[PDB]
C-alpha cells in the first residue's frame, strides 16, 4: 500500500555507505537486470545510455566521491535519474532502485533516486528521510563522525548500555579552531535545516533539468532561481545584522579572495574536505600551481567565469539575447526575468547554453579552491561543489550576491518603478498591526547519527546500534500577529507580509531605496475580506510560506508524516525554528511590511500538487511583488492605504 | 530693455551661497508659484515633474553639495533647466529664476539657469558673470577663501579703509605643499580662464542634452566632442613640452593609478575636496574598502568602465553599432565620427545608451577616488566630478587621452590617408610666412573675490565689502603674423593655421606621422584671394578661432560687453592670454602649419547665431581637416604648394 511503499522507500536509505544487507534487497539486486528486460522502461534510449556508462569502464565505482558539479558525474547521475524516472510502473522503479542501491555509487544513487522521487508522478508525495541523517558526513564535523565510530568500535558485547544509544554533543565550526570571523555565523550557515533547505530546493529544481521535458518551465524556474537566491541572501543579511555583521562582502575576481574557509567535515573514505586559505589568488596560474591538468576544462574556470560574466553583462545591458539561430530575442517581454534566470543559471532552458554556459558551476569550482582531479575517479571536491554543504561557505553567499547584482542591474535599467496606482488597492486600509513579542532562544536538537558508522549484518537488520547528535539550534517562542483591515466591500485579497531590517549594524536608518532587497517574505496567504472592519489572526505554526510559496504544503504532511515539527522535505521548507532571525538581549530591531492586493490567481498548469504543475503559488503577481524592483519613492510605499510598516524588536534569551 | 534684462541677469548671480536679499527678489520668490499658474510654461509635464521632485522629499536642499555627474542630481538639474527653458515668455522665466534662486539648491540652480540662458532662444546673447567670480570656491585654494573671510569678519566699523577692498595674492597648488610633480603645471591646469573654458563648453553642449530636442545635432556634437577634447589634450601637451614634460602618462585600469591629486579647494559648507593618493588601486575592493554602498551603482564604477571600454573597442573594430532594434548600423557613413562621438560621450543621441552608457561619468567617479555617498543628500564629490575643476586633475587629461585613443583607432582602421590631390589647392602657393617674435610673460590678474564671503543685508544691497584676488597669469606680447599667397585667379579660400611641436622634451624631431595629433588650431578664417600675389595680415587681438570655430563671436561682444579683454563666456572661448604656450628664456621651438583651401560652407541650419543653429563654423571640411586622420606621408604635407611649415621660438621672459 501507500504506507508500505513509504516504509520501503525509507528502508532504501538505511546505511547508504554500506551495501544493503536486507535479504529482499540482496535478492532483488542479484536477480534483477534492467538491461535484460529493457522493456519495462518507457524509453530504450535511457537504458541503453545507462548500460553504456555502466559496462565500458566509464562508471563511478562504489567508494568514490561524487560531485554533481563535475561534468561526467552529472551525466551519469542524469542517466540514472532518467532510468529511475521512466519506469513504466512503480514495481520496476523499485527493482531498479534496489539494484542501484546495491551496485551503483552511493552519492550518485542517492542523488538520482531523490530527484526521481520528488519528480516522479507516482512518488511525488513520498516523504524522504532527512538528508542530514542519511548522509551525515556532509552535515557534521569529523569530530562527531569519528566519535560515533569510536562508540561503534567499543560497542561489542561487553559494557552493555554503554557506548550505545549515546548522545554526541556537537559544536559548530569555530569552537576549537579560531577560524575566520565570517564563520562566526556557523549555527546558521552550518545548521542542518538550512542546508537541507538548499539541498531540497536543488532536488526540486535541478540546474540541469529541462523545463520542456520535466515540466519545470510551468514554474518559470528563472523567477524561482532569482527569488530563492535573493531570499536566502536577505535572510543571511538579517542574521548578520543580528550578530553585528554588515553587508555581504563584495569581491573582485581579479583581487585575492580575502575570505578563507576551513571546513571540519570529512568524506566517508577518510578524505578531509578542501580548505580555502585567506587571501587566495584565483588566477589560473595561482589556483593551478603545481598541478597536472592539461585536459580539465575546470582548470580554466577563471577564464570561463570571466567570459560568462561578460556575456551576462552584455545581455543585461542590451536586453537582447543570442540564440542558436544567432537572432535577436527580446528580453523585455513579460517573462524577461524568467529568460534572464534561465540564461544565468545555465539550465537546458537557457537561450544558448553554449554561449552563456553554467556560470555558477565554474564559479563554485574556482571559489572552492581545491586540487583539480587527477582523474574522473579520483576527485576532491569542496563544500561549494555540493548542494548539501554550499551554504556553509561564505564564498557561497558572496558568489550569489555577485550573481544577483546582475538581476538588480537588469531590473534597474529595464523596469519602471511602481507608482501609487500600481500598488494601490482602493477601498482597503491596513489600520494597525499587532505582533506578539518575538523571542528567539537556543535549544538542543536530536538527530539520528547512526548512519555514520559501519554496522554488521545483524546490526543492520535489527538497527541495534543507536548514536544521537545533540546540537544547539535557534528556536523562537510561538507568536501570533494580528492584521486589521478596513475594507469597503466583500473582496478577495492577497496578504503579503515581509520581514526586513530597519537599522544596519551601525544604527543608521536604511531607506527603502537601499532596503527593498533585504525584505524576507514572512507570510503570503489569501484572506476573504468583508465590508467594514476585519481582523486577521495568524499563528506561528500556521506559516508555511516563508521565503517561498507553498500552498499545497501540509496536505502532504497530513498524509505522509500525518500518517509534529518533523523535517518535511516537502517542497523546499525553511526550518520553522529559523523563521525569526536571532535577536539581542536588548533586542535587534527590524520591521514588518504588510501588503494587501486583489486576487490574481496563478496560471496553474494542473490541479495535482507537483513540481512543474504550477500549483505552488498563491497569486500571479511577480515574486516579492512590492519589492521585486528598485524603489524610487519610499514615501510612496508609506502612503499606500493598503500597506503598513510595523516595527518589532526580536529578543534573544540565553 | 535688453540692457536692463542683462543687468537683472547679472544681479541674479550675486552671493549665490546666500539667499537673495534684494527686495524685488524676495517679493517675487515669496509671491510667485510656478505650480500655481502651471500655464505659462509650454509644457505641463516639465512643471509636474519639477513639482514631484520639489515636494515629496526627493529634492536637493540648500547647502548640500551638487554634482552634475550624480544621477539624481543630474535628473533634478535637468528638470529645473526644462522648467526654465520652456517658459513661454521671458517674464515667466525671470520669475521662475528668482524663485529658484531663493529656494532651489545653489549649485543646481546655477547650473540649470546657466544652461537655460545659453540655450534659450531669447537669452542666448546674454553675457554671464565669470564663473570663477560667481562661485569662487571651485577656482581658488581654501587659503584664499579663508583669508577673504578673515577680512570679512574683521571688517566691522573700526579700522576703516582696512580689511576692505584688499587684494589677496594667491599662489598655485604647489607653493606650500610639495605635491606630485604632474601638478607643477598648476598655473595652466588651475588657471581660471582654462577651467572657465571647459565649464562653458560643457554648458554649451551638455553631455545629457539631446540633439533632437535641443537642436544640438545640427552641430554634430560628436565631432565637437572629439575635436574639443583632442585640442585640449594637444594644448596641454604643448605646455608640457614647454616645461620639459613629456607625453601624457598612459595608465591601465588594472594597475595602481600612479598619479595622485591633492586639491587645495574647499566646499562652501566647510568640506575639503577629496584627495587621491599616489598609486591608488582602482579595483572595486580597494576603492570601496571600508564603505557601506549596497545600492550605489557608482560603487561598481570599475566593472561599468571595463564593460563600456570593451563595447567601445568592439564597435570601433567592427565599425558596426548595436541599436535598440539590435540591428546593424553602418559606422562608415560620412557622419561616422559623429556617431562614434555620440556613442562614446553617452549623450541621448547615443546609438544605444543602455549598452554603451556614460563611460566618462563612471571613469570620473572611479578616478576621483572619493568616498561613495552615504545618501543622495550627503555627497562628497571630487574635482573630476565637476566641470569647473576637471582640468585641475591630471587624471582628467589621462582619462581623456585614453578616450581619444579610441577615436585614433577608429580613424586609423577605417579612414584612408589623404593623398596629394585631396589636400591640393591648384593655383595657390604659400610663398613664406613671417611671424613676429612670440614672447610670453606673467602678469597679475585681478578678479572680484567678494562672492566667497557672507554679507549682511545692507552689505548685500550696497556691495560695501570688496576683496580682490591677484594671480600671476601667463600673457603674451601682441604679435602680428603675415601670410603671403600667390594665387592664379580671384578665388575664395579658407586659411587654417595650426600650432604644434617640432621637438619633444628630449630634443628629438617629431615626424608628422607621430605628430599630426599635437597640432593646435591657431586661427581659422576665410580670405578672398586675388589673382597674383596676396598678403594676409592678422593681429593677435583679432584671433577668435583658437582650438574652436567661432565665426559669430565678437558680434555678441560688441552688443553685450560692447555696450576690453573681458571674460566672454560667448561660445567657448580660450583665454586670449593663454593662446601662446609658455616658452623658455632660450625659447622652446614649435612650428606653425599654414593651410589654404577652397571654400566649403557649412550646412548652417539657421542664420541666427545660436547653439545648435550650425552658424558656428567657417567651412564644411572635417574639424582639423588636414590632421583629422593619421598621416602616412609627411613629405606629402611638405610638398603641397598650398601648405607651409614655419618654425618659431616662443620666448619666456620673467
From TrEMBL, chains A, B:
InterPro entries in the cross-refs: Di-copper_centre_dom_sf, Hemocyanin/hexamerin, Hemocyanin/hexamerin_mid_dom, Hemocyanin_C, Hemocyanin_C_sf, Hemocyanin_N, Hemocyanin_N_sf, Ig_E-set
Domain Hemocyanin N-terminal: residue ranges: 3-123
Residue stretches making up the Hemocyanin middle domain: 130-407
Key words, A-Z: Signal, Storage protein
GO cellular component: extracellular space
One Pfam short name: Hemocyanin_N
SUPFAM superfamilies: Di-copper centre-containing domain, E set domains, Hemocyanin, N-terminal domain
Hemocyanin C-terminal domain segment(s): 418-652
GO MF annotation terms: nutrient reservoir activity
Coiled coil start-end: none
Protein's recorded name: Larval serum protein 1 gamma chain-like Protein
Organism in which the protein naturally occurs: Tribolium castaneum (Red flour beetle)
Highest classification ranks of the organism: Eukaryota, Metazoa, Ecdysozoa, Arthropoda, Hexapoda
Gene name as annotated: AUGUSTUS-3.0.2_06769
Amino acid at each position: 500500500n501507500y504506507s508500505q511503499q513509504q516504509r520501503d522507500v525509507w528502508r532504501l536509505f538505511k546505511y547508504i555507505n554500506q551495501p544493503s544487507y536486507y535479504k529482499d534487497h540482496v535478492e532483488i539486486a542479484h536477480s534483477y537486470y534492467f538491461y535484460d528486460h529493457a522493456s519495462n522502461y518507457a524509453k530504450h534510449e535511457v537504458v541503453e545510455e545507462f548500460y553504456r556508462y555502466f559496462k565500458y569502464d566509464t562508471f563511478l565505482q562504489r567508494g568514490e566521491i561524487f560531485s554533481v558539479f563535475h561534468g561526467e558525474h552529472l551525466k551519469q547521475a542524469i542517466a540514472l535519474f532518467k532510468l529511475f524516472y521512466y519506469a513504466n510502473d512503480f514495481d520496476t522503479f523499485y527493482k531498479t532502485a534496489v539494484w542501484a542501491r546495491q551496485h551503483v555509487n552511493e552519492g550518485m544513487f542517492l542523488y538520482a533516486f531523490s530527484v526521481a522521487l520528488i519528480h516522479r508522478p507516482d512518488t511525488y508525495y513520498f516523504s524522504l528521510p532527512p538528508i542530514y541523517e542519511i548522509y551525515p558526513h556532509y552535515f557534521y564535523n569529523y569530530e562527531v563522525i569519528q566519535k560515533a565510530q569510536h562508540y561503534k568500535q567499543m560497542y561489542y558485547g561487553q559494557d552493555g548500555a554503554h557506548y550505545n544509544d549515546r548522545t554526541i554533543y556537537a559544536n559548530y565550526s569555530g569552537y576549537y579552531v579560531n577560524v575566520y570571523p565570517e564563520q562566526a555565523l556557523a549555527y546558521f550557515t552550518e545548521d542542518v535545516g538550512v542546508n537541507s533547505f538548499y539541498y531540497y530546493y536543488n532536488l526540486y529544481y535541478p540546474y540541469w533539468m529541462s523545463g520542456e521535458e520535466f515540466n519545470l518551465k510551468y514554474d518559470n524556474r528563472g523567477e524561482i532561481f532569482y527569488y530563492m537566491y535573493q531570499q536566502i541572501l536577505a535572510r543571511y543579511y538579517l542574521e548578520r545584522l543580528s550578530h553585528g555583521f554588515g553587508e555581504i562582502d563584495h569581491f573582485d575576481w581579479e583581487v585575492p579572495f580575502e575570505s578563507g574557509y576551513y571546513p571540519s567535515m570529512c568524506y566517508p573514505n577518510g578524505l578531509y574536505f578542501p580548505t580555502r586559505h585567506a587571501y587566495a589568488h584565483l588566477y589560473e596560474y595561482f589556483y593551478n600551481y603545481g598541478q597536472h591538468y592539461g585536459f580539465n576544462k575546470y582548470a580554466h574556470s577563471y577564464t570561463h567565469i570571466s567570459d560568462y560574466e561578460r556575456r551576462i553583462h552584455d545581455v543585461i545591458d542590451s536586453g537582447y539575447v543570442h540564440t542558436h539561430s544567432g537572432q535577436k530575442v527580446d528580453l523585455f517581454s513579460h517573462e524577461g526575468l524568467d529568460i534572464l534566470g534561465n540564461l544565468i543559471e545555465g539550465n537546458p532552458e537557457s537561450p544558448y547554453y553554449h554561449y552563456y554556459g553554467a556560470y555558477q558551476v565554474f564559479a563554485r569550482h574556482l571559489l572552492g579552491y581545491s586540487h583539480q582531479p587527477l582523474t574522473f575517479h579520483k576527485l576532491h571536491p569542496s563544500a561549494l561543489e555540493h548542494f548539501e554543504t554550499s551554504m556553509r561557505d561564505p564564498a557561497f553567499y558572496q558568489l550569489y550576491k555577485k550573481l544577483l547584482g546582475f538581476f538588480f542591474r537588469y531590473k534597474s535599467q529595464h523596469y519602471h518603478y511602481y507608482d501609487e496606482h500600481d500598488l494601490a488597492y482602493h477601498g482597503v486600509h491596513v489600520k494597525h498591526v499587532e505582533v506578539d513579542p518575538l523571542v528567539t532562544y537556543f535549544d538542543y536538537f536530536y538527530a539520528d547519527l547512526s548512519n555514520a558508522v559501519y554496522v554488521t549484518p545483524e546490526e543492520f537488520v535489527h538497527d541495534s546500534f543507536k548514536v544521537h547528535v545533540a546540537q544547539e539550534r535557534l528556536n523562537h517562542k510561538p507568536f501570533t500577529y494580528k492584521i486589521y483591515i478596513d475594507s469597503d466591500k466583500d473582496t478577495e485579497a492577497v496578504v503579503k507580509v515581509f520581514l526586513g531590517p530597519k537599522y544596519d549594524e551601525y544604527g543608521r536608518y536604511i531607506n527603502l531605496t537601499e532596503n527593498w532587497m533585504n525584505f524576507v517574505q514572512f507570510d503570503h496567504f489569501v484572506y476573504k475580506l468583508k465590508s467594514g472592519e476585519n481582523v486577521i489572526s495568524r499563528n506561528s505554526h500556521e506559516i508555511y510560506n516563508y521565503i517561498h510559496d507553498r500552498t499545497s504544503y501540509y496536505e502532504l504532511y497530513q498524509k505522509a508524516f500525518g500518517v509534529q515539527f518533523h523535517d518535511n522535505q516537502f517542497f523546499f521548507g525553511f526550518p520553522q525554528r529559523y523563521m525569526l532571525p536571532r535577536g539581542s538581549p536588548e533586542g535587534m530591531t527590524y520591521q514588518f511590511y504588510v501588503f494587501v492586493t486583489k486576487y490574481h490567481p496563478y496560471k496553474a498548469h494542473a490541479s495535482v500538487p507537483m513540481v512543474g504543475s504550477g500549483m505552488h503559488y498563491v497569486d500571479a503577481y511577480p515574486m516579492g511583488y512590492p519589492f521585486d524592483r528598485p524603489v524610487y519613492y519610499e514615501e510612496l510605499f508609506y502612503a499606500l492605504p493598503n500597506s503598513y510598516f510595523q516595527d518589532v524588536r526580536i529578543y534573544y534569551q540565553g
